[PDB]
Amino acid sequence: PQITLWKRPLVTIRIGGQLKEALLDTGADDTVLEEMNLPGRWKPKMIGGIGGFIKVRQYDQIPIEICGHKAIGTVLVGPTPTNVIGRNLLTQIGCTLNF
Amino acid sequence: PQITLWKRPLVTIRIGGQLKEALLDTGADDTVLEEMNLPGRWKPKMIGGIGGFIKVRQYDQIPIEICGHKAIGTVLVGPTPTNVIGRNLLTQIGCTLNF
Numbered sequence: 001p002q003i004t005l006w007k008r009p010l011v012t013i014r015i016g017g018q019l020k021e022a023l024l025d026t027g028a029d030d031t032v033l034e035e036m037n038l039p040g041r042w043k044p045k046m047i048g049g050i051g052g053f054i055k056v057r058q059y060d061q062i063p064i065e066i067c068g069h070k071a072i073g074t075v076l077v078g079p080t081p082t083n084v085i086g087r088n089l090l091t092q093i094g095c096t097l098n099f
Numbered sequence: 100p101q102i103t104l105w106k107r108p109l110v111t112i113r114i115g116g117q118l119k120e121a122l123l124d125t126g127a128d129d130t131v132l133e134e135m136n137l138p139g140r141w142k143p144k145m146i147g148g149i150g151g152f153i154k155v156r157q158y159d160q161i162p163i164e165i166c167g168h169k170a171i172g173t174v175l176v177g178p179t180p181t182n183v184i185g186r187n188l189l190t191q192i193g194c195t196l197n198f
């Protein structure tokens with residue numbers, strides 16, 4: 001689909017069998033979701049943006065269906081202000097910026 | 100143009116006739132530029148990123164050419180590690196997300 005930016009580019013995702021809403025974020029290198037439980041082992045990591053750094057749980061090779069498109073990759077879980085789908089997964093679904 | 104997301108979508112922007120590299124960021128509601136001594140009045144504002152809020156100076160109706168496309172709007176200046184072009188300006192240059 002083609003998405004304009006007059007409003008936040010929010011989309012529904014399926015992860016761990018549960019539906020969630022997330023923001024398609026070209027400015028984020030990684031995908032970061034609010035605290036939640038996910039199958040498998042995770043590794044402690046830290047990521048930063050504006051405002052500073054936060055501690056997250058790194059889960060690898062996690063399947064996520066984004067607006068009907070399949071992706072399987074790294075998902076960071078932590079106290080992020082909101083769910084963000086970063087470039088690591090945006091590239092998997094063939095998402096590009098156009099103007 | 101079409102910009103893929105294999106690497107950070109950094110483009111050249113012109114503000115004050117000067118050139119800077121900035122990130123096309125669909126996840127940002129606002130445009131936040133690294134500290135720069137812009138002239139004129141401004142209003143204090145707090146913007147929140149992944150690691151918390153930072154204080155910025157809000158400048159209104161500032162001309163900004165993004166990768167050759169002209170825009171004009173609100174630009175926030177503060178201690179961000181990277182220049183970010185948010186939806187407030189991305190919409191002006193007709194930028195969309197596609198997949």
Ligand SMILES: Cc1c(O)cccc1C(=O)N[C@@H](CSc1ccccc1)[C@H](O)CN1C[C@H]2CCCC[C@H]2C[C@H]1C(=O)NC(C)(C)C
Nearest residue numbers: 027028029030048049050081082126127128129148149181
């Ligand atoms: C700058 C800005 C605004 O002016 C208004 C609203 C949000 C933001 C904002 O920082 N949005 C961010 C998403 S994280 C997010 C946080 C809160 C609400 C929605 C999204 C940016 O799109 C992405 N953001 C762009 C950029 C911000 C300056 C530092 C270098 C990158 C860091 C990157 C980022 O945070 N990456 C993570 C991997 C940690 C997620």
